[PDB]
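Sharing in case it's useful to others searching the archive later.

Someone asked me privately for the predicted structure of OBP14, so I'm posting the question and my answer publicly. Question first, with the sequence:
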Amino acid sequence: MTIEELKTRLHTEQSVCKTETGIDQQKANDVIEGNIDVEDKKVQLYCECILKNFNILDKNNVFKPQGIKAVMELLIDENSVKQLVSDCSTISEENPHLKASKLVQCVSKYKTMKSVDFL
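And my answer, the predicted structure tokens:
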């Protein structure tokens, strides 16, 4: 998957997840830029949607670390991807929606969705 294909895929998923959730464009932009308001309901839903559409969460919110690796190894070095997975794979959160926003927040420390567009 080329960087240009990932850019395009991200834009596509951002679009369909905005429509699915009704999130304000401003808040979607915040998420895309890596500023996640983890308590905001539509932010949570938008984050969940993007993760599910990449199959990183299954339909029952089972988290799949390999899905994160597949995407992130296009963007950062292999050891950093391992570090990311160890850092972000066991966030201490029982509420699946808050876990989804916290997951996107954690991954976004490494690369934000917006930053992919500059590559």
